[PDB]
Design a binder for this molecule. Structure first.
Ligand code: NA
Length: 261
């Protein structure tokens, strides 16, 4: 048995992470707006199998004026690698980022305590993600809830630029040609303010618009999966994608250098 009891699925490859689906078949259920205390409802995507143990859970928020359909593809994509994922609707489509932060946490509370799939979740291993204002809410949720295992803001928007108290491993994905949340005034200031003592990464999508996260995207899927695996599951098999090095080659037992050059 692996030393890490949270490892799920076979050893990853670039190919397996760029594929449309991971190794786990995915089921889905929903929670109504009425039943969702503190948020607007959502769709829950979960691995059908339970035979390898419980999974971490992820709540995902859409952005301003948007609904679940703008983030729906992430549900099956991420759940098929071994996560329980809820794509939420917000109380109103005009909710601001700090409101969306509270709703992300309310959705995780629902999943862990009241959902029909709560028995498939390890409640000690939770994460937040979101698009646009939902990505701003992801940063605020991470700042206010340091027990979270990971946070992934996608083309985030927020008026607060200072996230120097965030102690949750955070991957920010920006869009090079974003004109709605320009990376020069949102994503990059956010990343630069994060403490260097917090595990973090900034990934910028070449040529991309603000709406790249709303359609199936091989790059977003690959690095989102690797981030959640590495930090929600403590799965160091995924370090190779986040921190590539020649020693990832099976022919190379050690590689040291004064890179970059
Ligand atoms: Na090696």
């Amino acid at each position: 048995m692996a030393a890490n009891p949270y490892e799920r699925g076979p050893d990853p490859t670039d190919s397996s992470l760029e594929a449309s689906s991971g190794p786990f078949s995915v089921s889905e259920t929903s929670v109504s707006r009425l039943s969702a205390s503190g948020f607007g409802g959502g769709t829950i995507y979960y691995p059908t199998t339970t035979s390898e143990g419980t999974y971490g859970a992820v709540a995902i928020s859409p952005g301003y004026t948007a609904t679940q359909s703008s983030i729906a593809w992430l549900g099956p994509r991420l759940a098929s690698h071994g996560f329980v994922v809820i794509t939420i609707d917000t109380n109103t489509t005009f909710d601001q980022p700090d409101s969306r932060a509270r709703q992300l946490m309310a959705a995780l509370n629902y999943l862990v305590n009241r959902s029909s799939v709560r028995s498939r979740i390890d409640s000690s291993r939770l994460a937040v993600m979101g698009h646009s204002m939902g990505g701003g809410g992801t940063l605020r949720a991470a700042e206010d809830n340091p027990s979270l295992k990971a946070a992934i803001p996608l083309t985030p928007w927020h008026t607060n630029k200072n996230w120097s108290s965030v102690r949750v491993p955070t991957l920010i994905i920006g869009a090079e040609n974003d004109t709605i949340a320009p990376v020069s005034s949102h994503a990059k200031p956010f990343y630069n303010s994060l403490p260097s003592s917090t595990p973090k990464a900034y990934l910028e999508l070449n040529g991309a618009s603000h709406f790249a996260p709303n359609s199936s995207n091989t790059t977003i899927g690959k690095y989102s999966i690797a981030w959640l695996k590495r930090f929600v599951d403590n799965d160091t098999r995924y370090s190779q994608f986040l921190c590539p090095a020649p020693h990832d080659d099976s022919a190379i037992s050690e590689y040291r250098s004064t890179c970059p050059y």
